[PDB]
RNA sequence: UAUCUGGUUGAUCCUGCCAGUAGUCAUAUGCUUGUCUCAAAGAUUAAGCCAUGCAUGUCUAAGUAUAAGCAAUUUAUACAGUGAAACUGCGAAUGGCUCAUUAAAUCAGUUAUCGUUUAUUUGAUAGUUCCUCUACAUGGUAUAACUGUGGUAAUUCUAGAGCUAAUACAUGCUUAAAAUCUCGACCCUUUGGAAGAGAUGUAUUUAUUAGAUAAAAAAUCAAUGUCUUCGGACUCUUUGAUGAUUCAUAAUAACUUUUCGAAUCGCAUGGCCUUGUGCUGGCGAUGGUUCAUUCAAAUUUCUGCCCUAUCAACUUUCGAUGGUAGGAUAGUGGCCUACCAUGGUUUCAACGGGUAACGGGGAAUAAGGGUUCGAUUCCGGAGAGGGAGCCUGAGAAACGGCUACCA
RNA sequence: GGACUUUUACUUUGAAAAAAUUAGAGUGUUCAAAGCAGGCGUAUUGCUCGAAUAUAUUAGCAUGGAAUAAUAGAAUAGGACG
RNA sequence: GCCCGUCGCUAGUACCGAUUGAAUGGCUUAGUGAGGCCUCAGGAUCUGCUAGAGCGGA
């Protein structure tokens, strides 16, 4: 989730083809490009007032949300700009006419403009492959009880 | 699998072809063409299996090689050619003109239409899009691409196509109280009015339908084809008008007219 | 890779092979109707099992169920067309009381003797 | 050859996977053209479905756009200066995307001293008509202008010489020229 | 019986991977390459036969060679090859110049000749005429519906 | 279609298993065998080894005939019937076979492509082409078959000499009008003008711009275009699809070992007037760039596998989880590389071991709940003695294709 | 007039759902297993019914219900409405 | 009456066991390493354009 000072990286962070002319003096030192996510997901304020780049961001980045939309509790924040959801569910064993507690751990990419921690039930949506385990992107966040 | 499958095992054929279990290992495997293969009717099923004009597949080609069959106005020579919904199939000597249109049981039905009305067909616009050079265009279910259409034609609208020139002539919008043909699913073959289109963002908008008998049923939007205005079909419907009699009601009509 | 030709066996064997009372009754049915072997008895005990089963399954469904009415009647309509079910026994509760001789009675075997033509089941 | 499949990788839980099938062409990878600075040498590559691609292994002379001025010129590409991924690409003067190379100025100086009538950082009315109107637009960054003295401009390759066969870029301006000028020092 | 391969040097046989458009292999199918023994380019006593071709002729006549001259089997076929053969002009209408050959049945000498290709014919000039007309005709009709739509657009903006 | 019965005691009631009983798409075997219909069949063991033969080739009116082929008889003096061989094109990546591998894999149901390639089919789509005299009434070589000279015990081995074609190969002409953009000789000084020179098909690469619009109204700096009661008036200011995009589409400046823009073929022989081999002209074929469609493909979401803890920790040398950049791919992506973090899985059983394990549709048994099975007719997967490599091509990591190692 | 599940589980209806096979409708293959055939009439140029229907929900999608069973909220007010 | 264990005979089953005992299949360390592909080169022999000398192409 955490982010640097903007340009920490050996390569220049910027958004693609978003150009601000040095011949034309401006107020905002850097043009910023955002987009509406869709599905009624409200691109939050931190998205438009930040300096962060994160091309994997659902807003401000080049990924797009399509496919399944999942909700789950956030069990590990420890990675950088990605986290781990624990989705819980109850599986049916027909012979015994009862259920068994199972679970699945989903890595998802948490854009800056979201500050997430363990607790923190999270909505997440299918973005296309990001890295090798990551198919989902943080979209909406709900609070923690503790 | 290393490339295109060129064979269709019989029993993997579409069931609406109504091909018998025995008689061969294979089915016709429609060619690539205007219709999607599970949704089409290869000319050989029409001529030999439906119309009974040919017996062998060998005869089917003999007929076609003579140019005795047109589809949508052009000579089609391909044994497996994939004719489908709203196609024409004009057999000139024999003076017969048909249109491929669904049973109430889901099956492409033999339907004889006049010498006119063979002169046109109804395409349902699939996408509308802006081509290069600035020219917009419209694409239909049958794969027809027509530049320079009405700007009021939208995706899911239907279209009247001339077939001599191509050339869309008028059109119907997609909205409530329109007359609708169900092109797939459980209700394939039913005809009816609209009522409600329940939309869902992200996919699969449902269209609720009500037929002449005040029966209601739903399919997906994709399965809905716009054929005209209520009680006012723009093409000749086949017998029974997509009514869906119950199995009991079917039994009564059978033994009503058979016997007395 | 030709479509498979489906088939089914037409008869069933009894659970207890040695029963005096059941082996007599089967002999009787053999002699009255001119039967060949127990298998012919058996084939009919089978048909009856299938028809009583479909009836049972219909009678647990609420009356005026479209399935109960549609399949109920058709079952009864075929049983009458052969002369197994009487001109009115026509409710489903009655097919459940139907038994084997009712079927055995309708054999072209037994009809050739029933009206003239024979003067025996074995002549028949 | 090079396979791009995921099945050869361990799974997320870290278990080792057993080989399912033999490598398939449609997962094929290829060897990198390390494009260099020299006489133009470009080989085609017949890729999936017909579809030539172009490996540029030796190049000079490519197209660079001056974004603020709205024009593009074709220049020499003197050398490579920086590179974020691997400093060996700077050592070996390898042309890849995100290059940060120096290029010839003189096609850019020739277009400025024509278009704007001025010089860089030291008649015929219709010509003087345009020169006067276009002024007040004649001031560019001091960080850029100072480069023209040396004859070479800092630019960054925007294309993929290994794919297009073109080494193409844009001359470094704006905040981005500050960043790289700071790394360069 | 292994052939020599030009320019492989060596006085021996090696095993090479051979392609299309390379001597000593005829690929049996498309993209097929084969590994075959081939004999070096350098002469040694192990050659069964050495094939040479006369460059500059010597003093005395070689009996089966300098004496008898043997004919080309076919004459020109393409138009300008006939022209290049006889030294004709662009205006010269090859036609009646082409070579014919006599063949007897048992009782009937008949003649036969090639079919000149790249011949400038009434049919060919007609095909050019049809396509040209097709181009300009369609290009105008493509403007027609195009300005016609532009009006219907301004007419729906009124609607 | 919800059933039992025999065996422990002198006897008795239990526990409890052994025995009997019934089916088996379940295989073998033994003894017996007349008719009709139907028909599984070298899976189990040895994805062990194979003699021989066969299983992949293909021509229309319509790419190439000087067969020293055949028949003809043309109207025939360019060619014209039929037609071997060979070129060229296409197919051989379909089928058929098997179940070895494979246990989060495959597979099923369900998604994804705003994450891509797609011969072909079907529908669309092309006036722009080194013009610092130049064939466009049509450029150029080069080969096969063939002829003849040869090598080898031997093969669908081929050398060297001579001929000759194309829808092979290699080249290369072009057609209206306008408008808009730079440069600018000169008009002369003013709200100041412009002759004429170039550039502009498509595609390729990059940068830049537009693609608007959730309710309104002014101010200025710069630049700039259209009216003029000639002072300034200013115009009600033209814009698609999606839940969503940097989308479709368009503009600017350029870039390119410059992609495509018919030197192709078959039937017809009509019409104009200056009658010239003039000009024009019909129905088809085969091509050709882009787009769509169709037949596909490649990844992909969600949930779901048998026995085992006498497998409890596993993963990161040598990529393990993630970040940035690049490279690569058709394309996403640790697919790979450089740098940087230290993550990722696990008693809700990870990881490992076993399977006499390909998955599924389905099969047997028939109160119900369940138990057992599914090599094998359909779908999907995998392989072609074992591995790996790769050529051609839209498509193969092919095996009745090649290369190599092992056997 | 169109749009609240705080967040679920649960339950209803529906869509989307290959054929074969299973259940089952129709049909005298001479019966039957089967098959998807066929049935009339002058048999002189014909007419015509069929090739239903039911069925996994584990999971997903759409949906009606809010009992049961969980769950979130104002307490150092840092609460709600304006 | 029942009834236990050593000892002794016969047959069958597994077990411990020197033998660094053996076999087959998977995964491997390290050294070596076939082959094609990419790439730097090489240029047998052929060709184009501007007696000559020159600039390219396969
Ligand atoms: N070579 C294999 C075949 O050999 C026999 O064929 C019989 C033949 O079956 C043929 O095959 C078809 C498929 O089985 C039948 O449907 C046809 N009616 C018939 O033409 C029978 O109609 C004859 N009465 C006997 C003949 N020996 C076997 N008995 C078949 O079972 C078997 O498949
Ligand atoms: Mg915005
Ligand atoms: Mg049939
Ligand atoms: Mg929607
Ligand atoms: Mg049945
Ligand atoms: Mg350097
Ligand atoms: Mg020709
Ligand atoms: Mg006792
Ligand atoms: Mg005893
Ligand atoms: Mg006793
Ligand atoms: Mg006793
Ligand atoms: Mg037992
Ligand atoms: Mg007989
Ligand atoms: Mg029979
Ligand atoms: Mg044998
Ligand atoms: Mg075997
Ligand atoms: Mg296959
Ligand atoms: Mg395991
Ligand atoms: Mg699937
Ligand atoms: Mg050009
Ligand atoms: Mg004009
Ligand atoms: Mg704006
Ligand atoms: Mg150019
Ligand atoms: Mg080129
Ligand atoms: Mg004259
Ligand atoms: Mg798939
Ligand atoms: Mg990347
Ligand atoms: Mg990639
Ligand atoms: Mg990365
Ligand atoms: Mg196995
Ligand atoms: Mg089952
Ligand atoms: Mg029981
Ligand atoms: Mg199986
Ligand atoms: Mg096996
Ligand atoms: Mg088998
Ligand atoms: Mg394979
Ligand atoms: Mg074998
Ligand atoms: Mg094969
Ligand atoms: Mg292989
Ligand atoms: Mg073989
Ligand atoms: Mg039935
Ligand atoms: Mg029957
Ligand atoms: Mg549920
Ligand atoms: Mg309680
Ligand atoms: Mg012993
Ligand atoms: Mg030893």
mmCIF file of N, CA and C in Angstrom, chain C residues 7 21 29 34-35 54-55 60 72 80 84-85 89 98 101 103 105 110 116:
data_model
loop_
_atom_site.group_PDB
_atom_site.id
_atom_site.type_symbol
_atom_site.label_atom_id
_atom_site.label_comp_id
_atom_site.label_asym_id
_atom_site.label_seq_id
_atom_site.Cartn_x
_atom_site.Cartn_y
_atom_site.Cartn_z
ATOM 1 N N UNK C 7 -29.991 -50.753 -25.370
ATOM 2 C CA UNK C 7 -30.814 -51.931 -25.149
ATOM 3 C C UNK C 7 -31.022 -52.115 -23.655
ATOM 4 N N UNK C 21 -44.424 -72.428 -2.478
ATOM 5 C CA UNK C 21 -45.671 -71.747 -2.811
ATOM 6 C C UNK C 21 -45.536 -70.886 -4.068
ATOM 7 N N UNK C 29 -49.571 -70.866 -13.655
ATOM 8 C CA UNK C 29 -49.585 -69.897 -14.748
ATOM 9 C C UNK C 29 -48.966 -70.456 -16.019
ATOM 10 N N UNK C 34 -50.281 -71.900 -21.271
ATOM 11 C CA UNK C 34 -49.431 -72.547 -22.261
ATOM 12 C C UNK C 34 -48.030 -71.980 -22.374
ATOM 13 N N UNK C 35 -47.470 -71.492 -21.269
ATOM 14 C CA UNK C 35 -46.176 -70.830 -21.281
ATOM 15 C C UNK C 35 -45.041 -71.833 -21.462
ATOM 16 N N UNK C 54 -44.242 -46.464 -11.633
ATOM 17 C CA UNK C 54 -44.614 -45.169 -12.192
ATOM 18 C C UNK C 54 -45.913 -44.664 -11.577
ATOM 19 N N UNK C 55 -46.870 -45.572 -11.349
ATOM 20 C CA UNK C 55 -48.119 -45.213 -10.684
ATOM 21 C C UNK C 55 -47.871 -44.721 -9.267
ATOM 22 N N UNK C 60 -48.106 -40.164 -5.323
ATOM 23 C CA UNK C 60 -47.575 -39.271 -4.296
ATOM 24 C C UNK C 60 -47.557 -37.812 -4.739
ATOM 25 N N UNK C 72 -50.354 -39.773 -15.900
ATOM 26 C CA UNK C 72 -51.358 -40.658 -15.333
ATOM 27 C C UNK C 72 -52.311 -41.199 -16.380
ATOM 28 N N UNK C 80 -55.661 -49.627 -21.248
ATOM 29 C CA UNK C 80 -56.988 -49.961 -21.741
ATOM 30 C C UNK C 80 -56.916 -50.437 -23.186
ATOM 31 N N UNK C 84 -55.829 -54.670 -20.890
ATOM 32 C CA UNK C 84 -55.354 -55.064 -19.571
ATOM 33 C C UNK C 84 -56.177 -54.406 -18.474
ATOM 34 N N UNK C 85 -56.510 -53.130 -18.644
ATOM 35 C CA UNK C 85 -57.309 -52.378 -17.682
ATOM 36 C C UNK C 85 -58.755 -52.294 -18.175
ATOM 37 N N UNK C 89 -61.807 -49.595 -14.982
ATOM 38 C CA UNK C 89 -61.039 -49.497 -13.751
ATOM 39 C C UNK C 89 -60.237 -48.193 -13.710
ATOM 40 N N UNK C 98 -53.854 -54.086 -10.268
ATOM 41 C CA UNK C 98 -53.675 -54.959 -11.423
ATOM 42 C C UNK C 98 -52.629 -56.029 -11.119
ATOM 43 N N UNK C 101 -51.903 -62.031 -14.495
ATOM 44 C CA UNK C 101 -52.812 -62.720 -15.394
ATOM 45 C C UNK C 101 -53.571 -61.729 -16.260
ATOM 46 N N UNK C 103 -52.365 -59.204 -17.703
ATOM 47 C CA UNK C 103 -51.506 -59.120 -18.876
ATOM 48 C C UNK C 103 -51.479 -60.442 -19.628
ATOM 49 N N UNK C 105 -53.594 -62.622 -19.881
ATOM 50 C CA UNK C 105 -54.858 -62.881 -20.563
ATOM 51 C C UNK C 105 -54.854 -62.348 -21.995
ATOM 52 N N UNK C 110 -53.204 -66.609 -25.861
ATOM 53 C CA UNK C 110 -54.429 -66.899 -25.138
ATOM 54 C C UNK C 110 -55.680 -66.455 -25.888
ATOM 55 N N UNK C 116 -62.325 -69.797 -30.153
ATOM 56 C CA UNK C 116 -62.217 -70.888 -31.103
ATOM 57 C C UNK C 116 -60.796 -71.168 -31.508
#
